[PDB]
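Anyone? Bumping this.
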Amino acid sequence: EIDDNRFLEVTYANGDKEVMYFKDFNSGAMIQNVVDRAKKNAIKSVLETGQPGLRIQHLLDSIVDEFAENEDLPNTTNPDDWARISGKKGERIVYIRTLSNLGQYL
Amino acid sequence: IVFFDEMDSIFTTVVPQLLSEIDGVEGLENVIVIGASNREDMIDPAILRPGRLDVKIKIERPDAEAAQDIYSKYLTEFLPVHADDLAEFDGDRSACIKAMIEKVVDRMYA
Amino acid sequence: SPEQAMRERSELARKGIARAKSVVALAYAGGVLFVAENPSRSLQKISELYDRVGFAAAGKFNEFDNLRRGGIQFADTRGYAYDRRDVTGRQLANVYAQTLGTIFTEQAKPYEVELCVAEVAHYGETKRPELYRITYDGSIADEPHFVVMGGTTEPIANALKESYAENASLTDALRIAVAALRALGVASLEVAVLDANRPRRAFRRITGSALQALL
Amino acid sequence: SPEQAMRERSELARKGIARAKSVVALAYAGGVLFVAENPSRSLQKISELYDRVGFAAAGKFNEFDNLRRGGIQFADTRGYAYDRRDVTGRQLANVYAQTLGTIFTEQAKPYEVELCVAEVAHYGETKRPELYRITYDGSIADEPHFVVMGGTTEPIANALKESYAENASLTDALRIAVAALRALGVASLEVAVLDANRPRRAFRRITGSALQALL
Amino acid sequence: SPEQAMRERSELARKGIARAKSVVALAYAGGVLFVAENPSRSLQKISELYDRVGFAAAGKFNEFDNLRRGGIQFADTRGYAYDRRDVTGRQLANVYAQTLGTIFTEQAKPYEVELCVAEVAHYGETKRPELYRITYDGSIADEPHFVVMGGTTEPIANALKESYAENASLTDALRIAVAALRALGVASLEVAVLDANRPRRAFRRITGSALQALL
Amino acid sequence: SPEQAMRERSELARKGIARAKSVVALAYAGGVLFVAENPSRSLQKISELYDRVGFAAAGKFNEFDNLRRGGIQFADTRGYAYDRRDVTGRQLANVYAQTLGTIFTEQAKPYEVELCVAEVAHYGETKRPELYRITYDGSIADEPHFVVMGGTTEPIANALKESYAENASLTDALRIAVAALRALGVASLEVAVLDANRPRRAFRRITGSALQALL
């Protein structure tokens, strides 16, 4: 629940803002992508240093690097799948938010 | 090599079919899928997801130096040259061609 | 649809408050301290409202200066109609809440503003500083220690959460507030206090060389 | 279709009342008791309306406080125009019955408020406490024993249904009301009474250490 | 959609400011210098506002002359209501900003105008000239050295950036301003100064043969 | 697109001015000469505005007569409020420009009119005649020699370009103006002058047998 694994910010009809982390979107394909990215990082490390091994830090960094590239888990406007999570919540989901010369702002 | 060009024109649609075919051809590592698109912003990030099309490479315009290179590739040394222009370089055809390429590139890049 | 558009203003307004500068207000030994990130020398975001009531804001200026003026108007009309010691920070905060709610559900565009009304005790009196935050919804919240308005409020709010100390002197509270605000010289800071020790008018700006010495 | 628009207004008002804290009002030996779940120290949901008429509300603060103010205005104008003993809880309830109907049919968004008007007898007089509930529909329900407003009303209403006892003392009615409300300390409760024994102004808040002793 | 209306209003006003002649205002030893490219002999884009406050504009003539008139009105009403030395360039600039924030969001068509309010010190007094620029949105910018309005501002601004020199005489600042403006004779230039040396009314036009000698 | 709709508005006004007759005004030795092609004997397109200020128009009669009346109103209210010699052709032209711009942007249909305001010097005074042309949008142009309004303006404007001569007498300027207008007898011409030699009221119609002798 730390704010290092923030994924999405959802504002409901009630106006309650909730941070949905990766825990609510851990699909198996996402785990596969995490493992593949970690293995690619291992390739880079072994070709940079030469030591034939895989570090835990590789997977730990791949965890946060997984969502640096979009996985299609968030959607524009209100997703139908979100209307399903909204039904479980009991509050309609209204705002999905990832985590000039127009007047004067102070 | 299976190459696709002008893929910014396209992308519930044909995208899932393309992804399924790419996953099917993934077993054939010898076949290399190469896509081209001048508008990376319009390309649907679904194809940009990790996995299939991981490697993205940017390309650039011909730089002055690249223009001199490309001009040399067509304006080779075997093309006929004027005698008066040879008088400025004592009959050195390669040097004359290089100077002419430099001159035309400089004028066009001015 | 009331849900799409009464709420539609809520994103609009939230976005406007984020493209602004950050202001903090915190309690210290001598009263309350306002520290805002402000480059201009003419336009301000901290103001006296009444004898012991101060005011800070963040967001579209034509809007929070409109509120600044309205609040001044209100407070003086009350103080004259009844008496000076009858106008309280609580009334002012409540009026701002009603007014920001009425703009939220009637005007075309919601006021992209965030307000903080501050009050200290009278001279020779004893009482804790009161901070209220009024949002664009019309919502009002009672803060015990500090208010952070405008921009990205999370890092500043957390830095203040670690550094805050009740009964910190003026210099310590200034260091804490500038430090947490960084998460800037006298040419980019607007600093004022609600000095509880003044006899009547408690608001007092700290600018120039005096500000230079304090920080 | 006004048939469908009215339906979305009624649902919107119902959701707003549910999205709020809970208030109870019940009759006891000395008059009527209001017990509300209220965290703020400045914002109040229980109020004196006239000498013997009290008022509790649940919903949107700015709106039921708008009604609070309107009712105060009404009652005082009547009392001065005729006399104090002519203003009755019944008139007040009726005025809020018609104002909430007019708002519900004519204004953009219906008020999301639920009202309870309470009345006790005059000093040295004998008469049963009267409770009225006015909904956003403008319907007025005459309650003999207790009113529950805002949030989830079923569990509180049932707990009161089992625990209620006529002529319970002030402490027993407070225990029953807090217990049924739980279905909270002095820092999260707003408690007041319509004490039938007072000579003129019956409304009386119970806060701080006295409240601490009572509960 | 608030966003589309804002981006549509913004690109039309801007397609009007760049669709007009260019004006420059810069500080020099004796005060501030306005140099505008103006062919007509009757229609003017530089004007006195108050004793020490001048005004230049670029855009749609009827509208910035409407603002010219409103500002004159304002300044004189203040000067008479309080005193002459109380009206400052800062107040005027602020009023124009509020007015261009209200026109842009409330009227049908935004004003396609760019304003520059200038102020110098009083007679026998010492203080740096102040230049403010008010955009059609309602934003105000504090300028230390020079303002360029209307038409292709960037090429003219680039030249002034190289040629500007503080405390340049009237002739040098005129040469610099006309030169950077070219990036025109007395029959196509409108030139005026805010001469800080005048006792009261600082604004003074430079036309005809005197202008001929200066350039 | 409002901008494309504005192109339609401009076309509609231009169509109306073309669907009409032609008027010319030119400077000559004794002042300014108005020569219009006008069949009616009651409806006129040339008028006195003030002592030395005349007026000609082309388009829709009811509207340019509305402007005629408004201008008369304005000029007399000024002359009485200040003095006669204070009303100038320049003020009048400017008022017509503001008014036609406001009409062109705010009213349903734009005024399909084209105006020419003329001014000469006072008696025993020396100064060149001034001609201004105000178009339907609010644009105003300063003319040194002659104005042509309504219908097809190109051939008349060119014929005048070849035939014009400064300081031409009244008869020569009349011949030039009628000739270029043909590119008509006393029963189809409206002719008037702004005779600079008159003591006060300079406008003077030339009709009937006197007109017969002049042409």
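Late reply, but here is one note on the structure posted above: Strands of chain B lie at 2-4, 33-35.
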